[PDB]
Design a protein around this nucleic acid. Sequence first.
DNA 1: AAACTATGCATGCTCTACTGCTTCTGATCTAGTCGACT
Length: 84
Amino acid sequence: SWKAVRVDLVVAPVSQFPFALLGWTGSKLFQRELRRFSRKEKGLWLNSHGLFDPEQKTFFQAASEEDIFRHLGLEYLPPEQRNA
DNA sequence: AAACTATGCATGCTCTACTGCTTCTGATCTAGTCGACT
């Protein structure tokens, strides 16, 4: 007896770990809205690898996911509160 | 002394093979578009 269930594996270094976790934990709509807000309001580009500033060509790496929200001037939300 | 035949040379045509140069074809590869997923 056995059943087929899909599984997805993704790898990322420790430096890019918080960004990957944020991008792969939140909902699709939440990620879209966060990326749109980052691009429009603050002018920064957010993706699964890191946060980039077109003006200054320097990455905004961080050691935790809380810092990612803190940089964007946004109140932190737990994963359970990111549903859409 | 005369006729036949052995021996050789010069040349054109043809099969057969071999070496080298050039060109064509089969095989090994990056850009554009659509689509899948997350």
